[PDB]
Design an enzyme around this catalytic site. Structure first.
Site, PDB file in Angstrom:
ATOM      1  N   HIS A  44     101.187  66.767  49.354  1.00  0.00           N
ATOM      2  CA  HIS A  44     100.138  65.996  48.692  1.00  0.00           C
ATOM      3  C   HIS A  44     100.309  66.062  47.175  1.00  0.00           C
ATOM      4  CE1 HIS A  44      95.859  64.560  48.203  1.00  0.00           C
ATOM      5  NE2 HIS A  44      96.046  65.171  47.047  1.00  0.00           N
ATOM      6  N   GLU A  45     100.367  67.280  46.643  1.00  0.00           N
ATOM      7  CA  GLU A  45     100.559  67.504  45.216  1.00  0.00           C
ATOM      8  C   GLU A  45     101.854  66.863  44.720  1.00  0.00           C
ATOM      9  OE1 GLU A  45      97.618  67.929  44.084  1.00  0.00           O
ATOM     10  OE2 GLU A  45      97.506  69.579  45.517  1.00  0.00           O
ATOM     11  N   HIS A  60     101.357  63.228  44.105  1.00  0.00           N
ATOM     12  CA  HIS A  60     100.795  62.914  42.794  1.00  0.00           C
ATOM     13  C   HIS A  60     101.899  62.852  41.739  1.00  0.00           C
ATOM     14  CE1 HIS A  60      96.756  62.710  44.014  1.00  0.00           C
ATOM     15  NE2 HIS A  60      96.457  63.997  44.016  1.00  0.00           N
ATOM     16  N   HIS A 101      94.775  58.960  45.612  1.00  0.00           N
ATOM     17  CA  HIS A 101      94.097  59.248  46.872  1.00  0.00           C
ATOM     18  C   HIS A 101      93.882  57.962  47.670  1.00  0.00           C
ATOM     19  CE1 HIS A 101      92.235  63.361  45.497  1.00  0.00           C
ATOM     20  NE2 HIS A 101      93.540  63.419  45.691  1.00  0.00           N
TER      21      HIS A 101
HETATM   22  C1  LIG Z   1      90.675  72.120  51.575  1.00  0.00           C
HETATM   23  N1  LIG Z   1      90.242  71.605  50.307  1.00  0.00           N
HETATM   24  C2  LIG Z   1      90.130  70.252  50.121  1.00  0.00           C
HETATM   25  O1  LIG Z   1      90.357  69.394  50.962  1.00  0.00           O
HETATM   26  C3  LIG Z   1      89.653  69.933  48.742  1.00  0.00           C
HETATM   27  C4  LIG Z   1      88.347  69.193  48.904  1.00  0.00           C
HETATM   28  C5  LIG Z   1      87.913  68.674  47.583  1.00  0.00           C
HETATM   29  C6  LIG Z   1      87.903  67.322  47.344  1.00  0.00           C
HETATM   30  C7  LIG Z   1      87.501  66.845  46.121  1.00  0.00           C
HETATM   31  C8  LIG Z   1      87.106  67.718  45.138  1.00  0.00           C
HETATM   32  C9  LIG Z   1      87.112  69.070  45.376  1.00  0.00           C
HETATM   33  C10 LIG Z   1      87.517  69.547  46.598  1.00  0.00           C
HETATM   34  N2  LIG Z   1      90.661  69.049  48.215  1.00  0.00           N
HETATM   35  C11 LIG Z   1      91.706  69.550  47.480  1.00  0.00           C
HETATM   36  O2  LIG Z   1      91.893  70.730  47.223  1.00  0.00           O
HETATM   37  C12 LIG Z   1      92.621  68.455  47.016  1.00  0.00           C
HETATM   38  C13 LIG Z   1      94.018  68.761  47.494  1.00  0.00           C
HETATM   39  C14 LIG Z   1      94.084  68.663  48.998  1.00  0.00           C
HETATM   40  C15 LIG Z   1      93.620  67.302  49.448  1.00  0.00           C
HETATM   41  C16 LIG Z   1      95.505  68.883  49.448  1.00  0.00           C
HETATM   42  C17 LIG Z   1      92.604  68.436  45.503  1.00  0.00           C
HETATM   43  C18 LIG Z   1      91.200  68.169  45.012  1.00  0.00           C
HETATM   44  S1  LIG Z   1      91.320  67.701  43.275  1.00  0.00           S
HETATM   45  C19 LIG Z   1      90.115  68.677  42.501  1.00  0.00           C
HETATM   46  C20 LIG Z   1      89.105  69.381  43.119  1.00  0.00           C
HETATM   47  C21 LIG Z   1      88.277  70.084  42.208  1.00  0.00           C
HETATM   48  C22 LIG Z   1      88.672  69.906  40.905  1.00  0.00           C
HETATM   49  S2  LIG Z   1      90.044  68.883  40.797  1.00  0.00           S
HETATM   50  C23 LIG Z   1      93.474  67.303  45.048  1.00  0.00           C
HETATM   51  O3  LIG Z   1      93.144  66.130  45.111  1.00  0.00           O
HETATM   52  N3  LIG Z   1      94.700  67.753  44.557  1.00  0.00           N
HETATM   53  O4  LIG Z   1      95.680  66.767  44.511  1.00  0.00           O
HETATM   54 CL   LIG Z   2      95.849  66.580  41.079  1.00  0.00          CL
HETATM   55  K   LIG Z   3      97.685  56.936  48.101  1.00  0.00           K
HETATM   56 ZN   LIG Z   4      94.981  64.920  45.290  1.00  0.00          ZN
END
Ligand SMILES: CNC(=O)[C@H](Cc1ccccc1)NC(=O)[C@H](CC(C)C)[C@H](CSc1cccs1)C(=O)NO
Ligand SMILES: [Cl-]
Ligand SMILES: [K+]
Ligand SMILES: [Zn+2]
Ligand SMILES: [Ca+2]
Ligand SMILES: [K+]
Ligand code: NA
Ligand code: NA
EC number: 3.4.24.-
Length: 201
Positions: A134-135, A138, A144
């Site tokens: 996922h990262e 980006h 997303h």
């Molecule tokens: C198990 N945890 C999750 O599913 C959390 C849930 C969540 C969603 C939105 C906001 C906060 C938490 N998601 C993430 O950790 C994302 C990465 C996952 C999808 C691989 C992460 C969220 S981004 C930010 C969150 C807070 C400040 S910045 C992301 O998009 N990085 O690319």
């Molecule tokens: Cl990010």
């Molecule tokens: K996408």
């Molecule tokens: Zn993300």
């Protein structure tokens, strides 16, 4: 188009190391995670190859903070200050604030700010492998799935979520939505995406 290759450098911090116990336990687990990441990206005509590994068995060369932004910035700052890789992925045993388990620099692939941070949040190595895919997404110009109107995801099972959903939920993602793919193709237009052209050995 021809196959693209991400030459990947992984850093494992102190928390992660003390969580797994030993050097071999980490190498085992890293190879797990990277093997699955590479598996996910094969469906995009992409190969993800581990070219370097650094394990901080004593102390971290920078502060790994509960805040992903800080840690990520510290990584990119520390990294800039050598190698020859395309991307750097940090794996930490530090529990990020809230439910956040990953953070990345957008469209930074191949740049000097090419990196991301990942929390080993799951016993299943797949957990942190999906986070990193996922990262890494980006870094490759993906947004997303919920931020692209009419985005279509072909995951027939579970809740039909794809890799680039902004939340994992109860089931780890397995495929890339159609918008993921489209955005990746656009990123491969940028002249900076040239570093993905070299197949390693
Ligand atoms: C198990 N945890 C999750 O599913 C959390 C849930 C969540 C969603 C939105 C906001 C906060 C938490 N998601 C993430 O950790 C994302 C990465 C996952 C999808 C691989 C992460 C969220 S981004 C930010 C969150 C807070 C400040 S910045 C992301 O998009 N990085 O690319
Ligand atoms: Cl990010
Ligand atoms: K996408
Ligand atoms: Zn993300
Ligand atoms: Ca390269
Ligand atoms: K899976
Ligand atoms: Na947390
Ligand atoms: Na999911």
């Amino acid at each position: 188009r021809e196959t693209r290759y991400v030459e990947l450098y992984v850093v494992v911090d102190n928390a992660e190391f003390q969580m797994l116990g030993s050097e071999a336990a980490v190498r085992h687990r890293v190879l797990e995670v990277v093997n699955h990441v590479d598996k996910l990206y094969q469906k995009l005509n992409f190969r993800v190859v581990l070219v370097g590994l650094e394990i901080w068995n004593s102390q971290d060369r920078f502060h790994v903070s509960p805040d992903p932004s800080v840690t990520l910035e510290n990584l990119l700052t520390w990294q800039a200050r050598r190698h020859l890789h395309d991307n750097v992925q940090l794996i930490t045993g530090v529990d990020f604030t809230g439910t956040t388990v990953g953070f990345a620099r957008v469209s930074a692939m191949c740049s000097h700010s090419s990196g991301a941070v990942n929390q080993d949040h799951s016993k299943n190595p797949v957990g942190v492998a999906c986070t990193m895919a996922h990262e890494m997404g980006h870094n490759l110009g993906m947004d997303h799935d919920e931020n692209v109107q009419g985005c279509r995801c072909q995951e027939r099972f579970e809740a039909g979520r794809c890799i680039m959903a902004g939340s994992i939920g109860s089931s780890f993602p397995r495929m890339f939505s159609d918008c993921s793919q489209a955005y990746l193709e656009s990123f491969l237009e940028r002249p900076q995406s040239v570093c993905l052209a070299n197949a390693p050995d």
